[PDB]
């Protein structure tokens, strides 16, 4: 309890039918023991996370002053080591503290609480999964996280807490290691940086025994997820909850998808994939209701959001 408050204070085998109802019944069967969620930006839009693709907002205004050689440079490790300022100016905007987890995030928290969540693979860097209660062990953050930070020197790797980093960034002080003076950066996985070994190992193990895949707030044709979805055993049901199904646009990926076990919701061969088109929060609300978890989710969201306001 006090630990939860300190945590927040510092921060701030098949379906009967191919329908959401069918998935809910499957989830209540004894065969559904391991669930993997693959999530993208769509699960955080209701929290107020902006569309990072638009220069519209004042998000990148502070950056049009450092003159980056190419867009990806702000997340490239060799560039960071020579010019850390741009990334830290952007991180000031991205660090957690201004947003609360959504209904969708707390739904995954329930899966955790109930012993159903094997793993949550996320493309986001808003830290909302962790704020919602998911622990490192439950997560494969494709692009890393701002929650942990480490000295960039391979011979050092000293770790630093969120409050240590948070203070520096808001004070606009470039974080330096206290042991070796090298730069310290949040554990966002930069181009040219190796990701934790755990990522590959989870990707190679988790889909062998998964009983259900919940894909939310992301297109199926996204670099990481495209491959993971086809790794699950052939009998594993897969549910997509997103506002719209993405269109084609690219022959190789498309063909590889059709030949490798990609989602099949509508063909004559469809047998285990379900698409539920609408807002992620609405979809999790719908699913929770079918499972008899409406009130529990309700109280969870209300209570966690209130703890965040209270801080303490
Ligand atoms: Zn160091």
Curated annotation (Swiss-Prot):
Keywords: Acetylation, Autophagy, Cell cycle, Cell division, Cell membrane, Cell projection, Chromosome, Cytoplasm, Cytoskeleton, Differentiation, Immunity, Innate immunity, Meiosis, Membrane, Metal-binding, Microtubule, Mitosis, NAD, Neurodegeneration, Neurogenesis, Nucleus, Phosphoprotein, Transcription, Transcription regulation, Transferase, Ubl conjugation, Zinc. The keyword Cell division applies. It catalyses: N(6)-acetyl-L-lysyl-[protein] + NAD(+) + H2O = 2''-O-acetyl-ADP-D-ribose + nicotinamide + L-lysyl-[protein]; N(6)-tetradecanoyl-L-lysyl-[protein] + NAD(+) + H2O = 2''-O-tetradecanoyl-ADP-D-ribose + nicotinamide + L-lysyl-[protein]; N(6)-hexadecanoyl-L-lysyl-[protein] + NAD(+) + H2O = 2''-O-hexadecanoyl-ADP-D-ribose + nicotinamide + L-lysyl-[protein]. It is an enzyme of class 2 (transferase). This is NAD-dependent protein deacetylase sirtuin-2. NAD(+) binds at residues 41-45, 51-53, 123-126, 218-219, 242-244, 280. Changing residue 54 to A: Inhibits deacetylase activity. Isoform 1 is expressed in heart, liver and skeletal muscle, weakly expressed in the cortex. Isoform 2 is strongly expressed in the cortex, weakly expressed in heart and liver. Weakly expressed in several malignancies including breast, liver, brain, kidney and prostate cancers compared to normal tissues. Weakly expressed in glioma cell lines compared to normal brain tissues (at protein level). Widely expressed. Highly expressed in heart, brain and skeletal muscle, while it is weakly expressed in placenta and lung. Changing residue 267 to A: Reduces deacetylase activity. The chain holds residues 34 to 356 of 389 of the full protein. The active site is at 143 (proton acceptor). It comes from Homo sapiens (Human). Phosphorylated at phosphoserine and phosphothreonine. Its cofactor is Zn(2+). Changing residue 200 to A: Strongly reduces binding for the peptide inhibitor S2iL5. Its EC number is 2.3.1.286, 2.3.1.-.
